[PDB]
Specification:
The structure is cut from a larger assembly and holds three copies of chain A and one copy of chain C. By secondary structure, chain A is α+β, with helices and mostly antiparallel strands. Helices cover 51% and strands 13% of the residues of chain A. Chain C has helices spanning 9-15, 66-70, 221-224, 246-254, 268-287, and strands at residues 19-21, 28-30, 32-34, 54-56, 76-78, 97-99, 118-120, 142-144, 163-165, 185-187, 208-210, 233-235, 260-261, 264-265. The termini of chain C are far apart. The chains are: A alpha+beta, C alpha/beta. The PDB classes it as structural protein.
């Protein structure tokens, strides 16, 4: 609902400010998703990178939030594991590798 | 004007006086007594108080801009003393500024001075002289208003004529208020300027030569202040130094509310409140509802949303209005190393010591907390207190029985001994009039030791890192722990499916 | 006479109003005292506060001002109504303005204070000038004296005067004023003046004059007043020939340089009428 | 927005990066001229991480959005002199031009 309120206000701002939003306009959900602000992995699951060193898009209908930013996971199992110790995975000291 | 631009903290002598008045200060009471005695406030006293303010922790966090010193000290104090004190400061100005002007033109600006009496408000000839106002009206009329039509020129002329005439009437009243101070008569001004020029200009030339010139700002006094104000902003950009962060109060706009909500709902509501823009909701601080000042002392508390604030973009609740003020004074120490981190105040329950003692030991080691053994420490003190009760009741009953039965009769007497021995049986049946009170008191006594001990530890928090094993389970006793609120942070209980065998 | 009411420290604490920094360094001082009508008989406690700059003590019962001479830095005072039959004083360097209206003061004597730009003494028991000197009152540019007992205007030795105000008085004629070229403004409504015999046009600044409610019945005074400086605005109603309002017409005929009387700035056809009457009068005088 | 930039700055909702008012892309390319506010030449601001970034032009903005880390790894700028020049020549037209 916070997402919806933010995006509604953004609709009003788009209609005020700029025509380029008219060229973007195709797809309400696509816009909403694209605007969301996301974990260091953005698209990807962190856990599978940390364990495997492998890159993979976490499921976009996963929904965890942490330090303002939103996270997907490669599997519900990954979400469950992640939820037990999210802080371990974070890029604490240097960029993702 | 400059401080009002930066919105940093600053030294301002009047602001010192007004703060000392408003805070009901005892030094403020000295000021009041001096004023009420019809006696001056010493320049040296002002200097002292200014120095104290600069040493103040809120100033030390914020930083400052200064001007008030140096001043015309040399008639008594060396002006060098102010410069010396400035150099002594831990805080010597990274950014230095000056205005230059012609001596005559400075005087002319001084001539353009009058004060409104009953407000005390000090005003410029642009206000105070109607003929300067009307000369500016002449200028405004002479410029043909490029970008507008004659209809707009006539509308704005007639409206400004009404404004000007009403302003003339008002200033006429202000003429009943206008004065030129003794210092503002040109002779006094010139004397003052000459004296400053010699003593302060000579000293300040050295004060300047010391500094980084590229840091140092020069400015033209012959100017609109807005010019200089923006110039200072631009210089600050070149300098690439920010304002210090400022605590932002997050009470509802005019509102007082039930913030006694779900923590999560309250967090969301606060983060939405006062917001600037979509998406950029305030960040949580790490401690959620908790009052970081209380925890820095070592008391777990969670704060009102009315006493909740954001700073550095992060959100922080506090337990009280006075805690809000205190933290507004200076966040830094309580956040800074060892960083806001818990004490221990804990019990654990279960059978025996079966590593349980060891577990407490290892916890205390990790914490640098220290453990209470209720059996070793508490129980003999409690027992000796009950001994004291029993010896007291013995001596009281023996005294009363001796006195009354003598009213010679002695402790050997059989009715005396019957009365004594039955009343002391009843004293054994009764107890200390509420024994758990003493047990809590003793807990406090040992706590006071542990508090000191943790203050001696490098992170030096007020509160003791304390643990009890061997507390004896009674429900109403536990209630008394609530009534005095001598509560732990945490309790653990121990359980098994089958270690009741293994 | 009144109950003893000397000054009180608590009332000072109430009255002292604004703080300001004075002298060399940052030393600091109270400049204003609010003390209007606490009945006061006495003020002696003020003797310490001499750095003070502003007082109101009007309508107290104060019979004396001797401390004020010690109260050096006072720049302005209100003391109206108070019980002073004169205000004779040392020549105070500091006082810029004060008022002592409706006081018992009978006279203009005894006051000298150079910085004093303005004074007011309306309602006072005063009849004629009693000493003036602008080489003492270096600043005194305005005075008001409404509702006094004033006879006539001798000895107003003060070319410094911007303005003066004398309505509601006993005034019978001008004297002395005739020299005050800088004087712009004199108010004398509700007085006893019988005649206005061309009173000296060397008072050349006298942009405004008020003489309503007086005793002038000779319209030919207007002709005698033809030779006058830039008085723009006149008031002269309620006079025993203002009874007939060609008073204004005759006046503008006599004084083209005048621009307002009473309630009428001269409208374009009023000007044209008076102008053509003046033309005729001039041409006939040339034929005379 | 400019307003949003100033508010985040004053409210400290983000850190100023060490670059300050310097375009990191031009700096890393090697350039030493400070860019200047105009209606033709506004700031291009962007947010990333806990940090604020400021850029001259849509092309430099684009490059930085393609990869900020590349510029961030560059060594920090440091304060400078201004410039003072004199130029002298034949009558106005060339030298003035």
């Amino acid at each position: 609902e916070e997402e919806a309120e933010d995006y509604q206000a953004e609709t009003e701002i788009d209609e005020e400010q700029e025509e380029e939003e008219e060229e973007e306009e195709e797809g309400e959900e696509k816009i909403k998703e694209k605007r969301r602000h996301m974990g260091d992995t953005k698209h990807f699951c962190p856990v599978v990178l940390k364990e495997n060193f492998v890159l993979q898009p976490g499921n976009p209908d996963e929904a965890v939030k942490y330090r303002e930013k939103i996270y997907y996971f490669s599997s519900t199992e990954a979400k469950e594991k992640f939820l037990e110790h999210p802080e371990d995975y974070v890029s604490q000291n240097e960029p993702l590798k | 004007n400059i401080a009002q631009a930066w919105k940093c903290i600053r030294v301002e002598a009047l602001s010192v006086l007004e703060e000392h008045i408003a805070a009901e200060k005892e030094t403020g009471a000295m000021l009041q007594s001096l004023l009420v005695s019809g006696h001056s406030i010493p320049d040296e006293l002002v200097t002292k108080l200014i120095l104290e303010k600069i040493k103040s922790p809120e100033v030390a966090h914020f930083g400052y801009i200064l001007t008030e010193m140096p001043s015309l000290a040399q008639d008594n104090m060396t002006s060098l003393k102010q410069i010396e004190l400035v150099k002594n400061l831990e805080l010597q100005p990274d950014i230095i500024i000056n205005i230059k002007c012609s001596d005559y033109d400075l005087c002319q600006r001084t001539c353009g001075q009058r004060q409104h009496s009953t407000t005390g408000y000090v005003y410029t000839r642009e206000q105070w002289d109607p003929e300067i106002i009307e000369s500016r009206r002449r200028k405004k009329r002479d410029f043909p208003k490029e970008g507008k039509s004659e209809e707009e020129e006539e509308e704005e002329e007639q409206e400004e004529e009404e404004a000007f005439i009403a302003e003339m009437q008002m200033v006429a009243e202000i003429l009943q208020h206008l004065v030129q101070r003794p210092e503002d008569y040109l002779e006094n001004v010139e004397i003052t300027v000459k004296l400053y020029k010699e003593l302060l200009l000579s000293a300040l030339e050295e004060v300047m030569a010391e500094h980084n010139p590229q840091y140092l700002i020069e400015l033209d006094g012959n100017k609109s202040p807005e010019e200089l104000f923006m110039t200072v902003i631009e210089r600050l950009k070149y300098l690439n130094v920010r304002r210090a962060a400022v605590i932002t109060k997050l009470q509802g706009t005019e509102e007082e509310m039930t913030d006694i909500i779900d923590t999560e709902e309250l967090f969301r509501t606060v983060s939405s409140y006062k917001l600037i823009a979509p998406r950029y909701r305030w960040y949580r601080s790490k401690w959620a509802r908790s009052c970081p000042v209380s925890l820095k002392d070592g008391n777990i508390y969670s704060g009102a949303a009315d006493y909740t604030v954001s700073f550095l973009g992060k959100m922080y609740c506090l337990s009280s209005e006075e805690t809000l003020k205190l933290f507004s004074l200076n966040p830094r120490p309580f956040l800074l190393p060892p960083m806001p981190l818990p004490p221990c105040k804990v019990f654990i329950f279960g059978p025996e010591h079966i590593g349980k003692t060891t577990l407490a030991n290892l916890i205390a080691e990790h914490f640098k907390a220290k453990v209470i053994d209720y059996a070793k420490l508490v129980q003999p003190r409690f027992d000796s207190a009950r001994e004291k009760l029993i010896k007291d009741t013995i001596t009281e009953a023996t005294n009363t029985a001796i006195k009354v039965v003598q009213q010679e009769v002695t402790e050997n007497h059989p009715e005396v001994f019957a009365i004594l021995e039955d009343t002391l049986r009843h004293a054994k049946e009764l107890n200390f009039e509420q024994p758990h009170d003493k047990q809590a008191e003793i807990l406090e006594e040992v706590i006071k030791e542990t508090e000191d001990n943790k203050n001696r530890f490098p992170g030096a928090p007020k509160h003791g890192g304390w643990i009890v094993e061997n507390f004896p389970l009674v429900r109403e006793l536990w209630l008394s722990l609530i009534e005095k609120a001598l509560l732990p942070d945490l309790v653990v209980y121990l359980s098994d499916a089958e270690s009741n065998g293994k | 006479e009144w109950l003893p009411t000397p000054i009180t420290e608590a009332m000072m604490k109430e009255g002292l109003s604004l703080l300001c920094k004075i002298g060399s360094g940052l030393a600091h001082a109270y400049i204003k005292l609010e003390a209007k009508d606490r009945d006061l008989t006495d003020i002696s406690l003020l003797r310490s506060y001499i750095h003070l700059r502003y007082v109101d003590i009007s309508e107290n019962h104060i019979t004396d001002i001797s401390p004020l001479n010690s109260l050096t830095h006072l720049l302005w005072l209100k003391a109206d109504g108070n019980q002073l039959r004169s205000a004779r004083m040392n020549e105070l360097p500091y006082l810029q303005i004060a008022s002592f209206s409706y006081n018992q003061i009978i006279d203009t004597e005894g006051i000298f204070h150079p910085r004093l730009g303005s004074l007011d003494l309306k309602g006072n028991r005063i009849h004629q000038v009693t000493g003036l000197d602008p080489e003492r009152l270096s600043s005194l540019h305005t005075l008001e004296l409404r509702g006094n007992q004033l006879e006539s205007t001798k000895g107003i030795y003060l070319p410094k005067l911007k303005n003066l105000y004398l309505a509601q008085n006993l005034l019978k004629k001008v004297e002395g004023l005739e020299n005050l070229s800088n004087l712009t403004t004199l108010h004398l409504r509700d007085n006893q003046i019988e005649t206005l015999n061309g009173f000296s046009q060397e008072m050349k600044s006298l942009q405004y004059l008020n003489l309503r409610s007086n005793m002038i019945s000779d319209l030919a005074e207007l002709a005698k007043l033809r030779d006058l400086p830039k008085l723009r605005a006149l008031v002269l109603l309620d006079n025993p020939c203002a009874d007939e309002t060609d008073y204004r017409q005759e006046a503008l005929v006599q004084m083209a340089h005048l621009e307002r009387l009473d309630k009428e700035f001269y409208e374009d056809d009023d000007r044209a009428e008076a102008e053509e009457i003046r033309q005729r009068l001039k041409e006939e005088q040339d034929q005379d | 927005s400019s307003h949003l930039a100033h508010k985040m700055l004053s409210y400290t909702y983000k850190h100023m990066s060490s670059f300050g008012y310097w375009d990191p892309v031009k700096l890393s390319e090697g350039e030493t001229i400070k860019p200047v506010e105009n209606a033709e030449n506004p700031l291009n601001p962007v947010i990333h991480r806990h940090y604020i970034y400021f850029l001259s032009n849509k092309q430099t903005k684009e490059k930085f959005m393609m990869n900020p880390i590349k510029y961030i790894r560059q060594p920090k700028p440091k304060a400078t002199m201004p410039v003072r020049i004199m130029i002298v020549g034949p009558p106005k037209s060339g030298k003035t031009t």
